[PDB]
Assembly symmetry: D3
Homo-oligomer: 240 residues x 6
């Protein structure tokens, strides 16, 4: 391995410069199977990596695991191996009543409720997505006629208190996060997830292109995975 | 007289307008409105000069913000009260990347929040991000007139001098927090410095208002008073063209 | 001109070292008229500059516009041109019940609810007024017999949510500022305005003298006068 | 399942109240193998769970994945299912010259260079290990005669800039982290790893017991002994039943 | 004197490397009196110092006064004079219902509600007690059979608003501290006192060993002389085990 | 036996005093009181020594705060409960400007808040500003005795050592946050370092109490009994003007 965690060398990538990065290791082969000549390259910890061919060009699919820290490792090591464009495809809970389960969300920038982003840029730096990547994702979405919303996402280091869930062992939330969901809702934030603040900040601050799409699996105020996967693959096609 | 405390405007004055172009300089307001049909001066108090005009048969506002987040926040708030829902900022900027030339046009996707006013609308972790439709329109508009365009992140400072790490000043020094900061933003790919976008983008993105940001490069902090006029005009045509796409 | 924004040269100031700095560019000529030999020097953006004379000495009057950011430009550029003493004269909203519209407020120091002050000194540094400047303002106010209150001011980068106004487009205020007015009230803070934290910090941290006086125009519970005091204080500071 | 991620029911644990929590899903079976009647319960995302038996008492082995966020999910959901004691066994880079590759480190408390801990307690709250767990880990280490150091650990949300590595794509480190390693060294900090701040803070602030032990696999100033750290954590678990 | 505040020379310590550090200058003699050959060395400001002998070895007793700032001077200056181990013995208010007046609390680590700790290490660094010291205190407590609790302590730069007391001149508490006591209670914090965050941080970040024990003199949800005596016996016995 | 928890004073003991001079050092209390009429010791507990005396026929209090914001905050709170409304701190300080000489007296208009206790009264953005009348009284008093006097900003630290960027210590290092800090304060015109004013000024200005601050310079970082006496004469004269 050329890198500490992924168990990959630059030769393994066959010159690929674009990666699709789902959170779940099990989703990797599913994404790769939509493309040509899919092959498994490696699997270590939460990092499962497949290579495939899109319009004759090699593309990588690599899982990040849950959270900014594991995401930061995958992105950095892929960047060392030559990846320059990163498309995250995820699952999220919507926090707006007009967003329905099954819809797709394209993130322009994220509320940084994570710690890893701070390791790349101070808090005042925006966790903003690459304009070309966002454009490609929005177009891909419309391309298959998915119901699409574009806007801000809250990206949390936690699934529970950081997303103001009380269905927990302790049944309480630290002061800092009390009333936070209502605040983000009032500010128009679409959804919660757990990797975008780290991904977008680390790429935007290092000259790497990143974009973010997710299928809504729940709505906190009130099939889809395959929809979102089709979209991220089609967006990749436009960025090759 | 007015339905708002600072701008001296009534809702009837806007005649149903829902989009506003907001330059920083009061003197650029007439310049912008003239590019459009039926310009008429509405009001002028403090740093806020407001003209109405017409675009493809649609009423549009041009209103100056003055320098800085705090005067910007007043203008944006009061226009929103009067019914404005889309704000397009047209400004001047100092570039900090060598590959960016005077005369180029910058479209901001999002801003580093080196301001105080953004914090009155959202905590620091919230991104000072531009609306996607507005940014798209600005980028499409710049390509329409064939300007040299860069799209990316801008640092938005509450100060012209120490916050942009200028040392050619009365004290000649910069507080610890900002020492070495220009080099940091440069390394992080930041295109330029200006003084209003963090406030504008944060206050709009957190209140359901659409906002975009374009600026003409008038200096490069790594590398003509006449060019400053040509660049301005280049940037002005772009924001008007973008406006037409957002009606 | 010797400076980027103000459109002034050092010779323009004619040796002046004291400036009176209103927020409103429209108030400049008004203030300068109270003194001798008033003449317009320049007007660009929110920056209108007149020169005048007080007891035979040249003095500047220059608008800052609204907010710390434009204030920081004006002060820096005036300092480059030789100004050493800055007297702000402003308008304010009182937040104590006992303070009446028409009263005059002299600021000893400000709560830093601004961004620009941080570009000169970290938050722990006090946005404190110069002692001589404050003295002259308080004596001038007792001189003409205005009802004066002396104390701490909250200086905000916003007119609306940072002063906890709810009469707005959104009708809401970000968590950080909910209940803030009541908090400043309990701490004995007199008023809100929008430039003093930046002015006082930038001057106190660079060896410049600054003072701050304002006229109450609203009471969050319930000009010619303030201007008169600021002019008389200037005389005492020449 | 009774929980959103781990795919486990309370019945699956069979009354277990203690869990050993490695970072790596592939280490789970190895740990369970040291005990009696090991059986695999589930595997979803980076969460692999086995159950085994220690002195005839049921115990859980469940991987956290890398980082505070996935750790926070594992700990929370395990707590919902009845777990009250958590013992992390990890790998680490030592940052003191006197500490040798292969040594075992027991963490009394962590420097909080993570984000998830803040979702449980404000920064001023200490990321401190439970006294009984720490005592059990030290005694176990003593028991098997391993070279052991006891002290403070730096727990980072990143492997790279948060541990002030410059051998990277960008080759630079954000201002906040420049000179940080030398600072922790001067302050006697033993090592870096990536989950303890979240684990210790979330447990200490919710009445759950947690301890942390790790095998040194690199020395930033300078055979993995994973198996060495593993025997100690199992022996410590025995003392905590 | 070899130091700026304590009025002590290295020779005064007679080779001592352990100090017991009460907050109250008046408690110093009481503690020393439990030991052999107690002798008064100096008294300046809030810093009263005695020397004594514990199992034949010289030990120091030195008051810190109230608060991290004076504590930081005493610990620094004692370190210059050769002290490497610091055991604080204090008085505290319990904030858990199950903890009674007269109980003894041993602190594993502290919530840093102080300013002085920040002068030694950034806030993310834990105000954690030395493991050997904590162990000695817990074993000493069991030895004399006191009702003992072991855990986290909130260490505040104020006695009043920082401990959310409203029985005060102003009757109010600044926003940051409103609702704070209930938050610490929910997080299992045992008690409030005013010196441990500074002590534990400054020691843990400089290779010095520190421990912290206190007697409960009030319960904030629900004798003082006796309590003081119990805690003093424990800190002395712990010191014996750390020689 | 006491109306307050730490000071050991009842309100009747104050005999209607509404002003207190508050030195840091308990041992300076009697000295200050001896400048006035009918001085009597009231109490001594911990670092809090209190005397009462008479100035121009009016009762006045002298009460030591100990070193640091935390003990200061206790003294001020409990004195305020006892009826004190005006507080004049008299301290010793290290100058950090070349033009300020040893023996000079400094009047503080406001302080840099390098402390923790001030945060327990007001958030950091609130100014640790002195009362205008007290400052005026101190400046006039200083002119009255013809001391060499400077008026300005003071840096108020929770530590004597790393917070004042001293390297003459056991560990010989300073945490990143304070590296290069002294040069920065100097550049900003800060006059001096001491350890109680940020807490005193903040807690007073935010609770309707009057506070002023004067100190004698006993060291200059860039370049003591008599100096003490000079500042003491000034604080007593300022007190006369504030009765
Ligand atoms: O981070 C999240 N992922 C998926 C969800 F459904 C959710 O609510 N939060
Ligand atoms: O804020 C700025 N506006 C314009 C400039 F040229 C510049 O450098 N900075
Ligand atoms: O900044 C302000 N100026 C004037 C006012 F009346 C007010 O309330 N706030
Ligand atoms: O987090 C870490 N784990 C393992 C290492 F070797 C290291 O350096 N850092
Ligand atoms: O700091 C404290 N010491 C003693 C107490 F009783 C208390 O409540 N708080
Ligand atoms: O806090 C201080 N008091 C006295 C001094 F001389 C000094 O330098 N610092
Ligand atoms: O279930 C939690 C996961 O879904 C969304 C994310 O971002 C998390 O990884
Ligand atoms: O000259 C400063 C102005 O130019 C750019 C900005 O943003 C400021 O308004
Ligand atoms: O209305 C806003 C103006 O009034 C008071 C201030 O300080 C602002 O400049
Ligand atoms: O390789 C990174 C892993 O090692 C130590 C940790 O804490 C991480 O999980
Ligand atoms: O009463 C105040 C004292 O008690 C506990 C502490 O830590 C203080 O020194
Ligand atoms: O020696 C320390 C003392 O001097 C100045 C202060 O404020 C401290 O109390």
């Amino acid at each position: 391995s050329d890198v500490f965690h992924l168990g990959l060398t630059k030769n393994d990538l066959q010159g690929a410069t674009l990666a699709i990065v789902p959170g779940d290791p099990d989703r990797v082969e599913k994404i790769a199977a939509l493309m040509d000549k899919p092959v498994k390259l490696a699997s270590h910890r939460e990092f499962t990596t497949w290579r495939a061919e899109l319009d004759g060009k090699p593309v990588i699919v690599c899982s990040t695991g849950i959270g900014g820290p594991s995401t930061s490792i995958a992105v950095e090591e892929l960047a060392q191996l030559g990846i320059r464009t990163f498309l995250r495809i995820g699952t999220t809970g919507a926090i707006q009543p007009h967003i329905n389960v099954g819809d797709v969300l394209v993130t322009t920038a994220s509320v940084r409720l994570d710690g890893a982003s701070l390791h790349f840029a101070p808090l005042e730096f925006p966790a903003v997505a690459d304009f070309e990547c966002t454009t490609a994702l929005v177009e891909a979405a419309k391309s298959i006629g998915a119901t699409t919303h574009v806007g801000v996402t809250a990206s949390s280091d936690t699934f529970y208190p950081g997303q103001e869930r009380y269905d927990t062992y302790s049944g309480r939330v630290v002061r800092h996060f009390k009333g936070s969901m209502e605040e983000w809702q009032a500010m128009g934030v679409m959804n919660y997830e757990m990797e975008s603040a780290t991904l977008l900040t680390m790429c935007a601050s290092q000259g790497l292109r990143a974009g973010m799409v997710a299928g809504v699996i729940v709505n906190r105020t009130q099939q889809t995975e395959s929809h979102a996967v089709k979209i991220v693959v089609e967006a990749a096609r436009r960025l090759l």
